[PDB]
Amino acid sequence: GMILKRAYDVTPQKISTDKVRGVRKRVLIGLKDAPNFVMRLFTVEPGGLIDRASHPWEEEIFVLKGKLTVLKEQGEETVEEGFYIFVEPNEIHGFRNDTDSEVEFLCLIPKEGGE
Amino acid sequence: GPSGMILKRAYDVTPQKISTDKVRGVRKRVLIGLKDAPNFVMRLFTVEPGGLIDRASHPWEEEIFVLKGKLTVLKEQGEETVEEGFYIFVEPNEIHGFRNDTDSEVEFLCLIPKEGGE
Ligand SMILES: [Cu+2]
Ligand SMILES: [Cu+2]
Ligand SMILES: [Cu+2]
């Protein structure tokens, strides 16, 4: 009834699609465990990109490492470690890493969005 | 609901001192709270040196990510200390608590379904 684990030890999944490149995703608390919302840890390699998209659920993010470029419906904004982000349902968003080192952020979504 | 995206330095949020029968030496920042969240809330807890969130249980789950320091986790049986970069999943009704046995502040993110408050 209590899981305690080092996030780094969760095997990351490489994501490479027409919309996502240079990203790896760790599912920390996924559908097997979560009654309501899931916890993922994304690592964005230098030059990695999560292109703009939207979805019917909200997203809650905490920036763990580095300088994250946040794509908005209009323009972009760069945030750093120690920022949180709340993405309303349906809001256009994406992410890019313009720096020379890896960026990490924690991403939580309601379980309807999958893990 | 509303549109948009909030992007904010967590330390810009005004902490609240927590003091209850079972909690001493703790402050909390509500990052994404009831006034905005459709489903679950995001808090940043700071445990001062010596601070204690004593063993308890509640009828919602908790999801934690340790941001800073060495967090002692109190379990139904015994305890375990974890560090920055660990996550914790606490099932509904599972006994849990936390202590800071170190001389510097420990920080962790804590998310709960909004039915449990903020
Ligand atoms: Cu149990
Ligand atoms: Cu998204
Ligand atoms: Cu609790």
mmCIF file of C-alpha atoms and ligand atoms in Angstrom:
data_model
loop_
_atom_site.group_PDB
_atom_site.id
_atom_site.type_symbol
_atom_site.label_atom_id
_atom_site.label_comp_id
_atom_site.label_asym_id
_atom_site.label_seq_id
_atom_site.Cartn_x
_atom_site.Cartn_y
_atom_site.Cartn_z
ATOM 1 C CA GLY A 1 0.000 0.000 0.000
ATOM 2 C CA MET A 2 3.151 2.167 -0.176
ATOM 3 C CA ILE A 3 5.638 2.337 -3.031
ATOM 4 C CA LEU A 4 8.933 4.245 -2.456
ATOM 5 C CA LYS A 5 11.343 4.276 -5.436
ATOM 6 C CA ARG A 6 14.104 6.266 -7.089
ATOM 7 C CA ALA A 7 12.623 7.790 -10.214
ATOM 8 C CA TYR A 8 15.801 7.349 -12.226
ATOM 9 C CA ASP A 9 15.577 3.586 -11.731
ATOM 10 C CA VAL A 10 12.289 3.468 -13.671
ATOM 11 C CA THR A 11 13.137 2.509 -17.209
ATOM 12 C CA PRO A 12 12.578 5.485 -19.519
ATOM 13 C CA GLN A 13 10.736 5.050 -22.738
ATOM 14 C CA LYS A 14 12.088 6.754 -25.852
ATOM 15 C CA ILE A 15 9.404 8.773 -27.603
ATOM 16 C CA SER A 16 9.868 9.370 -31.311
ATOM 17 C CA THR A 17 6.863 10.384 -33.394
ATOM 18 C CA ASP A 18 5.985 13.022 -35.962
ATOM 19 C CA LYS A 19 5.182 15.301 -33.020
ATOM 20 C CA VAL A 20 7.771 14.248 -30.396
ATOM 21 C CA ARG A 21 11.520 13.764 -30.766
ATOM 22 C CA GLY A 22 14.440 13.620 -28.372
ATOM 23 C CA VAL A 23 12.289 12.851 -25.358
ATOM 24 C CA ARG A 24 12.169 10.002 -22.855
ATOM 25 C CA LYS A 25 9.266 9.307 -20.507
ATOM 26 C CA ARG A 26 9.237 7.470 -17.144
ATOM 27 C CA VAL A 27 5.862 6.329 -15.793
ATOM 28 C CA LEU A 28 6.353 6.628 -12.038
ATOM 29 C CA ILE A 29 2.766 6.122 -10.863
ATOM 30 C CA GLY A 30 0.746 4.657 -13.669
ATOM 31 C CA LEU A 31 -2.601 3.068 -14.296
ATOM 32 C CA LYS A 32 -1.814 -0.114 -12.377
ATOM 33 C CA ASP A 33 -1.607 1.909 -9.145
ATOM 34 C CA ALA A 34 -3.432 5.231 -9.614
ATOM 35 C CA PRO A 35 -7.103 5.609 -8.709
ATOM 36 C CA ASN A 36 -7.356 9.087 -10.180
ATOM 37 C CA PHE A 37 -4.201 10.636 -11.765
ATOM 38 C CA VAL A 38 -0.810 9.466 -13.002
ATOM 39 C CA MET A 39 2.733 10.724 -12.434
ATOM 40 C CA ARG A 40 5.299 10.812 -15.255
ATOM 41 C CA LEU A 41 8.841 12.190 -15.469
ATOM 42 C CA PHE A 42 9.887 13.541 -18.872
ATOM 43 C CA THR A 43 13.473 14.130 -19.944
ATOM 44 C CA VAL A 44 13.972 16.381 -22.942
ATOM 45 C CA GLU A 45 17.376 15.981 -24.587
ATOM 46 C CA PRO A 46 19.147 19.010 -26.093
ATOM 47 C CA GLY A 47 17.087 20.062 -29.105
ATOM 48 C CA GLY A 48 14.203 17.770 -28.120
ATOM 49 C CA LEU A 49 10.655 18.842 -28.954
ATOM 50 C CA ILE A 50 7.142 18.022 -27.820
ATOM 51 C CA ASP A 51 5.216 19.842 -30.510
ATOM 52 C CA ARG A 52 2.060 21.800 -29.888
ATOM 53 C CA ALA A 53 -1.020 19.821 -29.062
ATOM 54 C CA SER A 54 -4.085 19.956 -26.915
ATOM 55 C CA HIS A 55 -6.171 17.406 -25.058
ATOM 56 C CA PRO A 56 -9.455 17.369 -23.141
ATOM 57 C CA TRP A 57 -7.731 16.960 -19.742
ATOM 58 C CA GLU A 58 -5.610 19.371 -17.720
ATOM 59 C CA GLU A 59 -1.904 18.875 -17.013
ATOM 60 C CA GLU A 60 0.111 19.731 -13.895
ATOM 61 C CA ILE A 61 3.868 20.109 -14.260
ATOM 62 C CA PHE A 62 6.824 20.786 -12.024
ATOM 63 C CA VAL A 63 10.178 21.637 -13.645
ATOM 64 C CA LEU A 64 12.903 19.599 -11.988
ATOM 65 C CA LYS A 65 16.052 20.423 -13.972
ATOM 66 C CA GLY A 66 17.162 22.940 -16.543
ATOM 67 C CA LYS A 67 15.543 25.619 -18.671
ATOM 68 C CA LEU A 68 12.351 24.498 -20.407
ATOM 69 C CA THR A 69 10.904 26.339 -23.362
ATOM 70 C CA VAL A 70 7.119 26.242 -23.192
ATOM 71 C CA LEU A 71 5.226 26.529 -26.484
ATOM 72 C CA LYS A 72 1.918 28.400 -26.120
ATOM 73 C CA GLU A 73 -0.935 28.907 -28.584
ATOM 74 C CA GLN A 74 0.790 32.230 -29.179
ATOM 75 C CA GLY A 75 4.559 32.331 -28.851
ATOM 76 C CA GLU A 76 6.687 30.688 -26.187
ATOM 77 C CA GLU A 77 7.989 31.273 -22.668
ATOM 78 C CA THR A 78 11.089 29.837 -20.983
ATOM 79 C CA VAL A 79 10.920 28.648 -17.377
ATOM 80 C CA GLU A 80 13.450 26.993 -15.098
ATOM 81 C CA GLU A 81 13.799 24.428 -12.337
ATOM 82 C CA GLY A 82 11.415 25.248 -9.541
ATOM 83 C CA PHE A 83 8.567 26.499 -11.745
ATOM 84 C CA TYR A 84 5.216 24.810 -11.813
ATOM 85 C CA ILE A 85 2.869 24.889 -14.783
ATOM 86 C CA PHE A 86 -0.885 24.413 -14.888
ATOM 87 C CA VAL A 87 -2.223 23.728 -18.364
ATOM 88 C CA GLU A 88 -5.987 24.162 -18.536
ATOM 89 C CA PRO A 89 -8.027 21.563 -20.446
ATOM 90 C CA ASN A 90 -7.859 22.132 -24.202
ATOM 91 C CA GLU A 91 -5.052 24.714 -24.028
ATOM 92 C CA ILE A 92 -2.462 24.434 -26.811
ATOM 93 C CA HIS A 93 0.955 23.629 -25.338
ATOM 94 C CA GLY A 94 4.282 21.995 -26.181
ATOM 95 C CA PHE A 95 7.882 22.056 -25.058
ATOM 96 C CA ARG A 96 11.386 22.438 -26.438
ATOM 97 C CA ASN A 97 14.916 22.255 -24.994
ATOM 98 C CA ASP A 98 17.132 24.923 -26.566
ATOM 99 C CA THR A 99 19.973 24.327 -24.066
ATOM 100 C CA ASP A 100 22.986 22.026 -24.178
ATOM 101 C CA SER A 101 21.950 19.789 -21.251
ATOM 102 C CA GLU A 102 18.980 17.602 -20.392
ATOM 103 C CA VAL A 103 15.784 19.144 -19.030
ATOM 104 C CA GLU A 104 13.471 17.201 -16.706
ATOM 105 C CA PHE A 105 9.935 17.828 -15.587
ATOM 106 C CA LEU A 106 7.259 16.023 -13.621
ATOM 107 C CA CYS A 107 3.908 15.738 -15.466
ATOM 108 C CA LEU A 108 0.640 14.645 -13.928
ATOM 109 C CA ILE A 109 -2.637 14.101 -15.747
ATOM 110 C CA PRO A 110 -6.006 12.569 -14.813
ATOM 111 C CA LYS A 111 -6.111 8.883 -15.598
ATOM 112 C CA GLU A 112 -8.513 9.421 -18.545
ATOM 113 C CA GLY A 113 -5.450 10.677 -20.359
ATOM 114 C CA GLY A 114 -3.651 7.361 -20.049
ATOM 115 C CA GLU A 115 -0.178 6.929 -18.590
ATOM 116 C CA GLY B 1 -13.770 25.861 -17.380
ATOM 117 C CA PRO B 2 -11.260 28.670 -17.931
ATOM 118 C CA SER B 3 -8.546 28.581 -20.598
ATOM 119 C CA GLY B 4 -4.883 29.454 -20.408
ATOM 120 C CA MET B 5 -1.720 28.278 -18.720
ATOM 121 C CA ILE B 6 -0.196 29.359 -15.427
ATOM 122 C CA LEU B 7 3.587 29.335 -15.189
ATOM 123 C CA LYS B 8 5.052 30.384 -11.838
ATOM 124 C CA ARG B 9 8.095 30.040 -9.602
ATOM 125 C CA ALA B 10 6.913 27.819 -6.765
ATOM 126 C CA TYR B 11 8.873 29.817 -4.160
ATOM 127 C CA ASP B 12 6.867 32.935 -5.127
ATOM 128 C CA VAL B 13 3.839 31.273 -3.566
ATOM 129 C CA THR B 14 3.059 32.264 -0.039
ATOM 130 C CA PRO B 15 3.640 29.374 2.388
ATOM 131 C CA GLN B 16 1.320 28.571 5.154
ATOM 132 C CA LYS B 17 2.509 27.257 8.588
ATOM 133 C CA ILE B 18 0.902 23.923 9.362
ATOM 134 C CA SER B 19 0.222 23.191 13.057
ATOM 135 C CA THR B 20 -2.241 20.494 14.084
ATOM 136 C CA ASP B 21 -2.266 17.716 16.648
ATOM 137 C CA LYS B 22 -0.180 15.529 14.363
ATOM 138 C CA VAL B 23 1.844 18.071 12.408
ATOM 139 C CA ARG B 24 4.624 20.332 13.696
ATOM 140 C CA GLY B 25 7.513 22.042 12.002
ATOM 141 C CA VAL B 26 5.948 22.113 8.527
ATOM 142 C CA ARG B 27 5.029 24.770 6.009
ATOM 143 C CA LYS B 28 3.067 24.323 2.783
ATOM 144 C CA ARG B 29 2.706 26.170 -0.514
ATOM 145 C CA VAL B 30 -0.501 25.529 -2.492
ATOM 146 C CA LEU B 31 0.721 25.592 -6.085
ATOM 147 C CA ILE B 32 -2.390 24.379 -7.947
ATOM 148 C CA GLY B 33 -5.276 24.574 -5.517
ATOM 149 C CA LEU B 34 -8.993 24.096 -5.264
ATOM 150 C CA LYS B 35 -9.766 27.422 -6.884
ATOM 151 C CA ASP B 36 -8.236 26.214 -10.156
ATOM 152 C CA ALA B 37 -7.887 22.447 -10.274
ATOM 153 C CA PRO B 38 -10.567 20.333 -11.930
ATOM 154 C CA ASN B 39 -9.424 17.043 -10.368
ATOM 155 C CA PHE B 40 -6.292 17.078 -8.181
ATOM 156 C CA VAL B 41 -4.131 19.581 -6.329
ATOM 157 C CA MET B 42 -0.406 20.236 -6.141
ATOM 158 C CA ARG B 43 1.308 21.337 -2.900
ATOM 159 C CA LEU B 44 4.939 21.913 -1.982
ATOM 160 C CA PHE B 45 5.700 20.921 1.608
ATOM 161 C CA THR B 46 8.704 22.105 3.564
ATOM 162 C CA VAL B 47 9.638 20.102 6.681
ATOM 163 C CA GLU B 48 11.881 22.078 9.035
ATOM 164 C CA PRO B 49 14.663 20.281 10.930
ATOM 165 C CA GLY B 50 13.010 18.101 13.516
ATOM 166 C CA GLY B 51 9.560 18.537 11.918
ATOM 167 C CA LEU B 52 7.030 15.710 12.008
ATOM 168 C CA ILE B 53 3.905 14.706 10.087
ATOM 169 C CA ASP B 54 2.845 11.907 12.393
ATOM 170 C CA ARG B 55 1.386 8.633 11.240
ATOM 171 C CA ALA B 56 -2.142 8.934 9.862
ATOM 172 C CA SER B 57 -4.374 7.632 7.164
ATOM 173 C CA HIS B 58 -7.084 9.151 5.009
ATOM 174 C CA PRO B 59 -9.608 7.871 2.441
ATOM 175 C CA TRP B 60 -7.713 9.254 -0.581
ATOM 176 C CA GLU B 61 -4.375 8.395 -2.137
ATOM 177 C CA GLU B 62 -1.296 10.599 -2.103
ATOM 178 C CA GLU B 63 1.427 11.012 -4.727
ATOM 179 C CA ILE B 64 4.752 12.485 -3.637
ATOM 180 C CA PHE B 65 7.998 13.507 -5.289
ATOM 181 C CA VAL B 66 10.973 14.428 -3.095
ATOM 182 C CA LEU B 67 12.644 17.663 -4.224
ATOM 183 C CA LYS B 68 15.259 18.384 -1.542
ATOM 184 C CA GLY B 69 16.916 16.612 1.338
ATOM 185 C CA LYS B 70 16.514 13.332 3.182
ATOM 186 C CA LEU B 71 12.896 12.536 4.031
ATOM 187 C CA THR B 72 12.175 9.872 6.685
ATOM 188 C CA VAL B 73 8.995 8.031 5.707
ATOM 189 C CA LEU B 74 6.962 6.494 8.521
ATOM 190 C CA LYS B 75 5.195 3.273 7.541
ATOM 191 C CA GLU B 76 2.714 1.012 9.272
ATOM 192 C CA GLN B 77 5.721 -1.045 10.320
ATOM 193 C CA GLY B 78 8.914 0.881 10.718
ATOM 194 C CA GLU B 79 10.411 3.612 8.592
ATOM 195 C CA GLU B 80 12.669 4.263 5.568
ATOM 196 C CA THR B 81 14.647 7.369 4.565
ATOM 197 C CA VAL B 82 14.605 8.474 0.914
ATOM 198 C CA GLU B 83 16.267 11.420 -0.841
ATOM 199 C CA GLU B 84 15.700 13.896 -3.645
ATOM 200 C CA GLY B 85 14.520 12.133 -6.781
ATOM 201 C CA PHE B 86 12.387 9.503 -5.062
ATOM 202 C CA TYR B 87 8.652 9.179 -5.596
ATOM 203 C CA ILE B 88 6.106 7.777 -3.199
ATOM 204 C CA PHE B 89 2.639 6.362 -3.853
ATOM 205 C CA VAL B 90 0.424 6.031 -0.756
ATOM 206 C CA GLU B 91 -2.735 4.015 -1.371
ATOM 207 C CA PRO B 92 -6.023 5.143 0.164
ATOM 208 C CA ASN B 93 -6.203 4.324 3.873
ATOM 209 C CA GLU B 94 -2.501 3.318 4.138
ATOM 210 C CA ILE B 95 -0.745 4.505 7.250
ATOM 211 C CA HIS B 96 2.032 6.983 6.506
ATOM 212 C CA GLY B 97 3.865 9.941 8.003
ATOM 213 C CA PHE B 98 7.155 11.833 7.595
ATOM 214 C CA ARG B 99 9.990 13.213 9.704
ATOM 215 C CA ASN B 100 13.037 15.377 9.050
ATOM 216 C CA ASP B 101 15.920 14.051 11.121
ATOM 217 C CA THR B 102 18.463 16.346 9.351
ATOM 218 C CA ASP B 103 19.666 19.853 10.126
ATOM 219 C CA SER B 104 18.363 21.441 6.756
ATOM 220 C CA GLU B 105 14.881 21.814 5.256
ATOM 221 C CA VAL B 106 13.326 18.910 3.343
ATOM 222 C CA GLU B 107 10.968 19.647 0.482
ATOM 223 C CA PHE B 108 8.513 17.450 -1.373
ATOM 224 C CA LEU B 109 5.704 17.787 -3.834
ATOM 225 C CA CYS B 110 2.412 16.251 -2.665
ATOM 226 C CA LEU B 111 -0.630 15.728 -4.878
ATOM 227 C CA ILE B 112 -4.012 14.479 -3.751
ATOM 228 C CA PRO B 113 -7.422 14.274 -5.410
ATOM 229 C CA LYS B 114 -9.197 17.571 -4.759
ATOM 230 C CA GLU B 115 -11.931 15.821 -2.720
ATOM 231 C CA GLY B 116 -9.256 15.620 0.039
ATOM 232 C CA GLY B 117 -8.893 19.435 0.085
ATOM 233 C CA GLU B 118 -5.716 21.408 -0.488
HETATM 234 CU CU CU C 1 -1.384 -1.412 3.503
HETATM 235 CU CU CU C 2 -0.024 17.725 -22.930
HETATM 236 CU CU CU C 3 -1.368 11.922 4.150
#
